[PDB]
Amino acid sequence: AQRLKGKEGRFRGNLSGKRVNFSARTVISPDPMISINEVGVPVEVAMELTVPEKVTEFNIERLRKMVLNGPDKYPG
Amino acid sequence: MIVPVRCFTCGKVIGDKYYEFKRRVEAGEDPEKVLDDLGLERYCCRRMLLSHVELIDDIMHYRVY
């Protein structure tokens, strides 16, 4: 009965909300030089988070260049 | 823990003038006159000597090898 009740219980702790992958957290600092619909991302976070992309006929060369860059150069 | 070498703002080297200032101000001479004698015109430098506290001397007693 305890597992199914409370804020830390199953229903409210592991069903209505949960911890997720591909997420980052850090402090914020002002930047008036970027557009309102843009966010500045640390290079350390950018090389940690990834966006899966499929290879197509119109993006093959860019993906090939990134694969050549490896996991250490920024656009890799 | 020890006197800094240069004033944080302007960069003038004031690392050698701390002991002289302390001795003369202890002897009885007016602190402002001592500072003016040392040539610290801008108060950015005078702050560094006036507010400094010597803390190297009481941490030397603990050694780590």
């Binding site: 009965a1 199914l4 009740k5 219980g9 229903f11 409210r12 069903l15 209505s16 | -």
Partner: protein, 390 residues
């Protein structure tokens, strides 16, 4: 152009507009035409622009308006105060305000913490101060202990003794022989001795050692005149009409009191308006109460969310609270109720009844892990397969 032509044009091509819109457009066009000479084409173009704006301002189907309303009510609630004002100002009665008032309204408490009514006088006595005071005197109610300047539980001879204050008499034009007459009419076998600012009670039972104090308090608490439950009353002027504010609440009896305008009298107790005037009047009262409470704090909230809340609460013919014993408790889904509160009781009750959950809501679908039926989750798509590139 003539006003009749404008009126015909408005209803000709702007027929889809809401009624208030069609009337406001006519009023504004009439006002503007005299100051600036308007041509026929200008009127037509203005009407077309209004129609286009109305068309582009409509709500998009599939919009989850309920969550938006809930958030638009909850978010300003972090900015309201708790201590309210706590000031009297003669013409005002202290009442709960801020967040606790909103909580009271939403939870639809059977009896509010600070009941209050606003009584409008009929055309007679409405504008006269003295006549309004007379009507308030008719409405205002008191008991014996209030009139007492002092009270004496005399023990040597075992008689109740009361000392009377002139001010409690003069507040209402009441006089002592009237109080005595009501005392004799409402009880028997009691002395009720008439004295200058003094009254003595000594029945046979209170004459002995056992039945003085208990019967003394019963005599002390009797009301000789006035409406039940209305502890206090205050008169003040709004604009050019005088109105009456009252402590406590009895909506049933006030509408029958002479001099009261029954078409405009309100009370802050929702469960009274519901029983006296019906469910729709209760809905209107809830809307007005929430609007006034949030307006007094300086916060701006659109009326539409409050309409959604009021319509949701006043749906089963009664005024249900929002919470465990109300709207949430009426939800058909077992899992939706279980995730809110008292999960185990709901689960076991559903097991007993053999209840069936159809997963028609949002919370259950989120629990399962399948798209919710709101927003993009309700759109259905089709395509013609033989697609050839161009």
């Amino acid at each position: 152009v003539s006003l009749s032509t404008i009126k015909s044009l408005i209803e000709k091509k702007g027929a889809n507009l809401p009624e208030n819109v069609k009337s406001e457009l006519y009023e504004k066009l009439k006002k503007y035409n005299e100051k600036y000479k308007l041509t026929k084409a200008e009127i037509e173009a203005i009407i077309d622009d209004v129609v286009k704006e109305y068309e582009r301002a409509l709500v998009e189907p599939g919009e989850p308006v309920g969550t938006v309303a809930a958030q638009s009510i909850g978010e300003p609630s972090t900015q309201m105060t708790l201590n309210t004002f706590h000031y009297a100002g003669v013409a005002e009665i202290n009442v709960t305000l801020g967040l606790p008032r909103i909580i009271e309204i939403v939870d639809a408490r059977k009896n509010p913490s600070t009941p209050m009514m606003t009584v409008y006088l009929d055309e007679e006595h409405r504008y006269d101060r003295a006549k309004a005071e007379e009507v308030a005197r008719r409405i205002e109610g008191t008991t014996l202990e209030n009139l007492a300047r002092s009270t004496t539980l005399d023990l040597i001879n075992f008689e109740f003794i009361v000392e009377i204050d002139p001010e409690r008499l003069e507040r209402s034009g009441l006089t002592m022989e009237k109080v005595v007459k009501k005392l004799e009419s409402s009880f028997k076998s009691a002395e009720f001795e008439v004295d200058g600012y003094t009254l003595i009670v000594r029945p046979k039972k209170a004459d002995k050692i056992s039945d003085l104090r208990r019967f003394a308090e019963k005599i002390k608490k009797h009301r000789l005149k006035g409406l039940s439950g209305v502890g206090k009353t205050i008169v003040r002027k709004e604009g050019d009409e005088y109105v009456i504010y009252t402590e406590g609440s009895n909506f049933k009896q006030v509408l029958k009191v002479p001099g009261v305008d029954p078409t405009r009298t309100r009370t802050n107790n929702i469960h009274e308006i519901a029983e006296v005037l019906g469910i729709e009047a209760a809905r209107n009262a809830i809307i007005d109460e929430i609007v006034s409470t949030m307006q007094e704090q300086g916060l701006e909230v659109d009326i539409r969310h409050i309409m959604l809340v009021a319509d949701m609460m006043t749906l089963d013919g009664i005024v249900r609270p929002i919470g465990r014993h109300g709207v949430v408790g009426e939800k058909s889904s077992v899992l939706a109720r279980a995730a809110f509160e008292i999960t185990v009781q709901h689960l076991f009750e559903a097991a007993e009844k053999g209840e069936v959950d159809n997963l028609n809501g949002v919370i259950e679908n989120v629990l399962i892990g399948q798209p919710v039926p709101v927003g993009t989750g309700m759109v259905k798509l089709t395509m013609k397969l033989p697609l050839r590139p161009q």
